[PDB]
Design a binder for these strands. Structure first.
Ligand SMILES: [Zn+2]
Ligand SMILES: [Zn+2]
Length: 373
DNA sequence: TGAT
């Protein structure tokens, strides 16, 4: 058992170091909890270890490098086989560690590595963004720690003394922000079947209510809109869960959560979202609140379909339009743009579904009627 | 809390 393989850390050491507030100052140390397993994952790990290292002065003593050195000697003492390794790390890898791990993974086909991170370290700096992409390209699976992973880390690596994991405040909100930020910097592309199923604008017949939202930013430069290549990606609604958001968090709200986190300066910005469902009343109300308190942001909403929330969605769309949002139904050019930009198309061109233009026309006339009532 |  992992309790016999490692010295479990103090609960205060865990909670202070793994708190997932995205901006968190004062932490002088990186912590790394790991398991080494066979290709069969269910059974107990072959070994488990806790590594720590000061962030400064030298990356060579970061826990990622300590792991690599330990693992290399450990493998000499054990019969060779394929290994799946899991890390729970308090900070994501710096540029030096990301490159060393990437080089190790790239030259060893027998090792597979998954890294769950509590916080993203310097996620806004291009050097760190690039290094995480290099690591992902070497085959490392990078994810944000969620409730289940904090709970698992607590059970395995912490001297909890039988007490259960207790989540800190805003663990879910932090997770969603970091998860969207990670997908952004790794340039995650949306699955093509997922795109086609969710942005098809024919009358909806599935029992599923899910919302996918693609977003982009432009900057005003010399009375011209220029792309801002930094903040481009997609996200989806968060389904309810008592350990996440008990009543869910809709895509439009998760989108609004990102904007302050980008730390846009005082220049004029146009933020565009392509959302498979138009926002419900509560989403459009929060969107209207945002516009009114962020006047350097011009909001543009393109929707594939109009969502009837059985409530005040028509008033919500009217309020959003009057407060200055541009609201429009997606036409062929916007579907093609999202396919070309946000979808893992593997070079394949946009293949429009039957009736795309006719459905866009009917929906545009319905939107027009809503906004003029 | 934008974090030697
Ligand atoms: Zn490092
Ligand atoms: Zn909504």
């Amino acid at each position: 058992q992992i309790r016999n393989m490692v010295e479990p850390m103090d609960p205060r050491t865990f909670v202070s170091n793994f708190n997932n507030r995205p901006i968190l100052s004062g932490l002088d140390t990186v912590w790394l909890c790991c398991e080494v397993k066979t290709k069969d994952p269910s059974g107990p790990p072959l070994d488990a270890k806790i590594f720590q290292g000061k962030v400064y002065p030298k990356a060579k003593y970061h826990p990622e490098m300590r792991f690599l050195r330990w693992f290399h000697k450990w493998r000499q003492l054990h019969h060779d086989q394929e290994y799946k390794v899991t890390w729970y790390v308090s900070w994501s890898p710096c540029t030096r560690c990301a490159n060393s791990v990437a080089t190790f993974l790239a030259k060893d086909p027998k090792v597979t590595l998954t890294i769950f991170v509590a916080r993203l370290y310097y996620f806004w700096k291009p050097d760190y963004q690039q290094a995480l992409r290099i690591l992902a390209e070497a085959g490392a699976t990078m994810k944000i720690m969620n409730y289940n992973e904090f709970q698992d880390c607590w059970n395995k690596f912490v001297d909890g003394r039988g007490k259960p994991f207790k989540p800190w405040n805003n663990l879910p909100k932090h997770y969603t922000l970091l998860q969207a930020t990670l997908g952004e910097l790794l340039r995650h592309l949306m699955d093509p079947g997922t795109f086609t199923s969710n942005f098809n604008n024919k009358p909806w017949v599935s029992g599923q209510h899910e919302t996918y939202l693609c977003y982009k930013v432009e900057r005003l430069h010399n009375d011209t809109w220029v792309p801002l290549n930094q903040h481009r990606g997609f996200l989806r609604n968060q389904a309810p869960n008592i350990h996440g958001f008990p009543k869910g968090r809709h895509a439009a709200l998760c989108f609004l959560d990102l904007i302050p986190f980008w730390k846009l300066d005082g220049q004029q910005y146009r933020v565009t979202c392509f959302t498979s469902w138009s926002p419900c009343f509560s989403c459009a109300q929060e969107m209207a609140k945002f516009i009114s308190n962020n006047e350097h942001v011009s909001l543009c909403i393109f929707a594939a379909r109009i969502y009837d929330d059985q409530g005040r969605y028509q008033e919500g769309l009217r309020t959003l339009h009057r407060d200055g949002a541009k609201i429009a139904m997606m036409n062929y050019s916007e579907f093609e743009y999202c396919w070309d930009t946000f979808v893992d198309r593997q070079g394949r061109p946009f293949q429009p579904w039957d009736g795309l233009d006719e459905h866009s026309q009917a929906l545009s006339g319905r939107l027009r009627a809503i906004l003029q009532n």
